[PDB]
Each structure stands twice: as C-alpha cells, then as structure tokens.
Amino acid sequence: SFETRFEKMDNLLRDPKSEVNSDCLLDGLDALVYDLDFPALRKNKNIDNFLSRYKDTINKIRDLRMKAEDYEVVKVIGRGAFGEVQLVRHKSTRKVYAMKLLSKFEMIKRSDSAFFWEERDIMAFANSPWVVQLFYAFQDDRYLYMVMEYMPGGDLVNLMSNYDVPEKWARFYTAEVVLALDAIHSMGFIHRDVKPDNMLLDKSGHLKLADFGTCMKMNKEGMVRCDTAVGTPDYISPEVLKSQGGDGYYGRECDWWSVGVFLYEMLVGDTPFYADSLVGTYSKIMNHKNSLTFPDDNDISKEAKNLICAFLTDREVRLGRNGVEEIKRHLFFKNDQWAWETLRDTVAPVVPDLSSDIDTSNFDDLEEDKGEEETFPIPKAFVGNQLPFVGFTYYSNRRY
Amino acid sequence: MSFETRFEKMDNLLRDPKSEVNSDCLLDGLDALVYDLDFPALRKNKNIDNFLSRYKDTINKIRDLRMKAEDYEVVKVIGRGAFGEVQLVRHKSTRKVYAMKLLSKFEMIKRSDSAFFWEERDIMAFANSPWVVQLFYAFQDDRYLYMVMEYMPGGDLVNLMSNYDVPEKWARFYTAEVVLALDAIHSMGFIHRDVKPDNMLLDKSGHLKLADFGTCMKMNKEGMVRCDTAVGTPDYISPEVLKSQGGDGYYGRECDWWSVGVFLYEMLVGDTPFYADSLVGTYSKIMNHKNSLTFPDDNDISKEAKNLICAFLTDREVRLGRNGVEEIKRHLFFKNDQWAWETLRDTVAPVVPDLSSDIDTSNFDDLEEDKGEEETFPIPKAFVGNQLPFVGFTYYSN
Ligand SMILES: O=S(=O)(c1cccc2cnccc12)N1CCCNCC1
Ligand SMILES: O=S(=O)(c1cccc2cnccc12)N1CCCNCC1
Fold first, then answer.
1. Cα dist. A111→A140, A400, B44, B290, B317 in Å?
2. Helix axes B254-269 and B303-312, enclosed angle (nearest 10)
3. Is residue B359 part of an annotated ligand binding site?
C-alpha cells in the first residue's frame, strides 16, 4: 500500500535501532564529506562539485550536532589503548558526565573486533541500574565519543588498594556483581571480562559494570563460538583461555569463574593465580585444581573458601552452570543485612563523601593534555575510513 | 542557542522540505554512496566491503519502499528531447494523472549540464504560483531523475499557433499571461532566460503556465546574473544573453521581456522575427535587430502591437520593462474591455480545451519512438561518484 510504505519508511527513519535513522543518515553524510574533502580527491569534478554544494550545509550541521567542544573537560580519570575517559561538564547544560573518547585510527590500526558497537548498545539500552548509562554518542573524523554517567565512587581496584576488605563487604560486592552479571546475561551476553577495573561505584557506593568491549551475543544454545581467547590474565577462565581454533565453544560460566577470582582477591589481597610473570599466571590457571591454595590466614570464613572454590573449578562442575539461583542460594551470601531482590536498596559498606559534582578524590591522578595524537593519513584515493563508524551517533534518535 | 534549541533546529532540519539535509536528501546520500561504491574493484577496500555488506539488506528495502518508477503506469509519451521524455503517467496506487519528466543521469553527466535541474525542481516545487507548473514528486534511481508534475491538457502555445492564425485579442491575452507569469518568476528572484511557446502550457481551463525552468538563475544583489553557456534555438533569446557567450556578461531581467516581444511578433506574424535557415543565421539577424526587424505590408497588425513588439525588441538600456513590469502593463496594446491584469487568470480563456477523459492527449502531437539504447556508465576502477550531482533531488509533498 502507498500508505503502509510511507509509514514503514517513516519508522525506519525514527527507530532508535534503525540502521537508517536520522543519527545514521546525518552520520552517513557527515562521513562522506569528511572522506571526500582532500585536495587529491577534489580533482574529481563530482566530488569537488558535491562538496561545494554542501559546504555551507555540512558546516551548519556540524555546528548544530553534538561536538567535542560542547564539553568542558574537568579532568582525565582513565586511559587505555584506543582512548581515554574524562570527567566533563557540558558547557550548555552544566551537566556533569564521564565522556569516553575512542581513537578511530587506533581501533582501525589493528583491533579486529568493532567492539564499540556492543558497548554502545548495552550502555544505551540496558536500562539496568547495574549498567553504566550511555546518554550521548557522537563522533567526528578522529574520535568516537561516549557520554556516560559519572561514577564518583571510583572502581573496585581503588577500593581494594585503600582497604583490607572484610567479609561483610566482600559479600556485598560479590552479590552486586552477581546481580549485575545476571542482568547482562539476561540481555543475552557473556561478559568475558569481569574485573574490579570495570566495577564502578555510584555516588551512593553501589556497583555498576562499565566497559563492555568484550561482550558477545549468546546463541540459542546460550553458548559462544570463539577461536581467540579474550579477557584479562588473572581473571580469564580455563575454558576461555584454552579456547582454540579446534572449536572454542563455552557458556556463561566463564563469567562466574571470574567472580570467584574477584572474591578471592578481596579477601586475600592477592589474585588466586598471581605469578612472577603473566605467563606464570597462565600455567597456574590451567592448573587451578592444584594451584588454588589459601594462605595460612584464620579470617577467611568456611563459606568464603567454599564459594571461591565452587567458582574456581572446571566448567562442568562450576557453580553457576545451573543458573544464577544456585549461586544466590550459597551459604557465603547468607546474612542478616540484605536480601538479593532489595540489595541495591540497602546502604553500601563504603559511601563516598563528595565535595562537588566534579569530585574525583576516588580516582587516581593522571597527566591531562598529552598533545593531539596522530590520526589517519591524508588519503590519496578514496579510502572511506569514516564508513565503519556510521550510525554510531546516539543523539537524534535515542530511546526515552 | 540552548541545547534544546540546537537539538530542535537540527531535528526540524530533518523535516524541512526546503532543506538540503531533510530526511529524503540524506537518504539519497546513502542510496547514492551504495551505487558509486558497489563495484568489485572498490570492494577491495574493507571500509567499503563492510559498509556495503552492512547496508545491503537495508538499502534495498529502502529503494523498494520509496517512490520508484514502476509506481507509475505510462499512459503515453507527450514530450521528448533534452535529457529525457515527458510522459503522461497515472499513479498505480493513487490512480492520479501526472506529467512525469525524465532526465538521463548519464546524458547529463556526459555533456556537462548536471545542475540546471536544481532551479527547475526548486521553482516548480515551491513557487506555489498559478503561473508555474507544479511539481508534486521528485524521485530518482541510478539512471534517471524523475519530475512528477501537473499535466497541462491544453497543450503548448506552439501547438496552438500551428492550428490557428492567432488574432490580436488572443495574442494580447497570452502576452498578458506570460508577462504576469514571468513577473512572478522574477518575484522569486529568477531571470528565466528561455521564454518560448514550447514551455508555455495551457491548463484544462486554457490558462497559461510556464514549464521547463532549467535555465533560470538567482539574481545577485543588484538583480543581475552573469553566465557563460552555449545557446540552443536563439529565436527567442535576447541580444544581451547572446553577447554573453563566456561569462563576460551580466544582464538584467529585461532579457525575458525581449523574448515576450519575440513571442508577440510570432503570434501576429506566424514566424519568428529573426528566423533564418541556420542557427548562426538567426543569431546574426538577432544582433542586427535594429535593421532585421520588419513587419509585412499587410497592416493587419495594429499600431499598438507594432509599438510593443518594437518596445520589447530593442537594446536592453531602452527596452520596455527596464523600469519594472508596471510600464509594460501600462502599454496601450493591452488596453482592452475584456479583462484587467489582477483578474486576468479568472477571465475565460480564448481557447478552452474540450477533454474526453483525464488522459486526453488530443492537444499533444504523437511522438516518434526513441529507438535509443541510452548508454550506461562504465564500471569504475576508482571512485567516480556519478551520483553526487543528483544527491538531494528527491522531494515528496504532503
Ligand atoms: O575512567 S574509567 O575507565 C570509566 C569508564 C566508564 C565509565 C566511567 C564513569 N565514571 C567514572 C569513570 C569511568 N574507570 C575509572 C578508573 C580506571 N578504571 C576503569 C574505570
Ligand atoms: O510535454 S511537455 O514536454 C511538458 C513539459 C513540462 C510539463 C508538462 C506538463 N503537462 C504536459 C506537458 C508538459 N511539453 C509539451 C510538448 C512539448 N513542448 C514542451 C512542453
């Protein structure tokens, strides 16, 4: 029908998940002009003509659309390959955020994943108090930007370095993590990289997961097929580690194993598979059956040792293989301070005391500035480097 | 501007028809970027092979959903030449009759001239004047631009003049409607440059409208328009536009009035005042208009008619209409007791077409067969971008 058509087309233009919404189209055009405006390319009439036709237009667009200079960088609060994360204040709204920058070039400079789609998707649509929230995603010719909510409480790595974590606390966090992961699993993802670095605390001291660059959609059997291991040395599960071209087919248990590693570390202060060198940790992980030993410390409760072991074991017998409910029913969690379904409503073990909306006391210092890093080389022929990053923008068609 | 402002100015830009970034335009940019990239040679680049593999599913569905050629049933061709054929079409779904124009993307690309259509699209889509043929839909594909306009069943003035020995009363009426039409086009800030009987069409009521505006241009600060472009059929073209072969020339709107003069002479005489066997012949006689312009020894043509024709057919500097349209309207030739300017298009036309059906083409000559195998673009080894000149042409009405 002539009506049905105008409508479907209207929906494809609106839907916050359509590959051709205003966000995708404005991006598509923005990408083109960006990937054409080079003297070597302008030699071609069409290109030159087109660009002059859209010169005034494209410029007005880039001034109306969300851009980097719309934010006042309060301070850098995290770095990594592919880019950094900075405490920013939106110049116009005065609203404070944690904006994540991603070097378009760096990711293109061998990253073999396009990981950022998962992260954009999850943080933008999860709508879970366990997931860091993405408010805006925009880009330019050099960086991807992810305007997320700021977690003033800092990460769990920082917390652990400042306190000798008592069981009560360890229980609380392990519990919030378990609920957080369960929520991510519910969205149909295996996290694959559960670690204290990605565990952040809000202004109330409650946990949220950030950084989902390793998340991968589970199949109908609830499994994942991967020939190359992903994650972190200390926390990678024996199966994700051994994952080979021979198959590489594991379930969500790999996350629970990591939770065990997480628990062991809070109580002990060391990782269950620490070694002189990374490669040592590798051997100790595969040999978990023998390498998993607790130091002679009379303070790790029976239950704690039990759960840690229930997690740090071969997938087939690992606690969690039979849904999250069997983890929750473990004795280690048995307490008289909270119940699972109301946990994030109980008072946290460490509540941050913040001086201002931009208080970064719970984040280690970092240099700032650096000096504009090298990006793509000026094209001699049409390369189209902005094409892989079309539709990343989350601004014109976001969900409400 | 607040964040709310900025956000909304942008969100409205996506919905404005008069916007180059409207959703339709943007959808072109993508639709196009798929065509001028989906070549085995270009697939080598991953950013391309990936970009295309991602939008394959989507882009196809899009092209099928949007307004496409096979949405129209071609009733009969009613005009050809230029870069395509004007055909009588009935919308398959709405069952509405339209005059659809086609423009070979390749043909334009081939012989430069791939920018004229912007003016025509704009004027016919936004003029909103009864003196202008209306553009309802403008869509495209990889090969043709399409301009779904309103059908003018009364045919053109060329046809009318070939069937009647135009009397003065009639000549006056049409000259008057042309004058009003052009003035309206001038009001939008355009110099027409190509006023001729071919583009003068009559509606079902026998009233004039201008079609084909692919020669109009925006008047600069002082109301002029420089230009350098070859000239086809100079019969109606003015001395200034002619002496402007190469950009070495700025002319006013009075170039259109000269054409109106040519128009009037032809209706009353039956031939163009500067006709010659060759194009260069006509051109020469046009330049030597101070001497070449003669009237036959049959004083059928009235005093006023001879005056106006001469008032138009003269050097720009002294040409009638250099002091606004009002001095043309006040000419005696138009002095009559049948109509007044401000109500002219409300008076009964000298020739009202009698139509048999909504698809009656009796007032249009049968056209030949093209037999043409419209050449196609060659497979590019790099990025040619033969779609970029036609990006933002797509236009829909509400
Ligand atoms: O800056 S973060 O990358 C970071 C990522 C994502 C969202 C964030 C929200 N607020 C603060 C920091 C955030 N981060 C802080 C210290 C370094 N460890 C990783 C967590
Ligand atoms: O068919 S047309 O091309 C034509 C052009 C533009 C709009 C039209 C609208 N209705 C009918 C014919 C139309 N045309 C009549 C015959 C040949 N002379 C040129 C004008």
1. 19, 32, 19, 77, 70
2. 140
3. no
Centre of ligand 2 to C-alpha B184, Å, is: 20
Sheet with strand A134-139: strands edge to edge: A71-78, A85-90, A96-103, A143-148, A134-139
User: For residues A237 and A254, what is the distance between their CA atoms, to the nearest angstrom?
Assistant: 5
Judge whether B343 is closer than 8 Å to chain A, CB to CB: no
Exposure letters A48-71 (e unless 16+ CB within 10 A, then b): bbbbebbeebbebbeebbbeeebb
Experimental method: X-ray
Ligand 2 centroid vs B82 CA: distance in angstroms? 12
- Shortest CB distance from B47 goes to which of A5, A61, A385? A385
**A91 CB neighbour count, 10 Å cutoff:** 12
How many angstroms from the chain centroid is the CA of residue A107?
Answer: 15
CA distance B325 to B175: 13
Question: What is the three-class DSSP state of A343?
Answer: helix
SS3 track for B29-97: HHHHHHHCCCCCCHHHCHHHHHHHHHHHHHHHHHHHHCCCHHHEEEEEEEECCCCCCEEEEEECCCCCE
Q: How far apart are the first and last CA of chain A?
A: 30
* A-chain residues near B33 (CB < 8 A): 28, 32
Regarding the beta carbon of B142 and ligand 2, being less than 6 Å apart is answered: no
For chain B, domains (ranges, CATH) are: 1-155+355-398 (3.30.200.20), 156-354 (1.10.510.10)
Phi and psi of B186, rounded to 5°?
-65, -35
Residues in the ligand 1 pocket, defined by CB under 6 Å = A 77-78, 85, 98, 100, 132, 148, 150-151, 155, 197, 200, 210-211, 363
Q: Residue B217 to residues A281, B130, B234: CA-CA distances in angstroms? A: 75, 20, 18
Burial of A222 (0-12, 13-18, 19+ CB in 10 A): exposed
Q: Which helix (H) or strand (E) holds A157?
A: helix A156-162
**Which residues does B297 contact at the CB level (< 8 Å), separation at least 6?**
none
d(C-alpha A155, C-alpha A201), whole Å: 6
Residue A99 burial (CB < 10 Å; 0-12/13-18/19+)?
buried
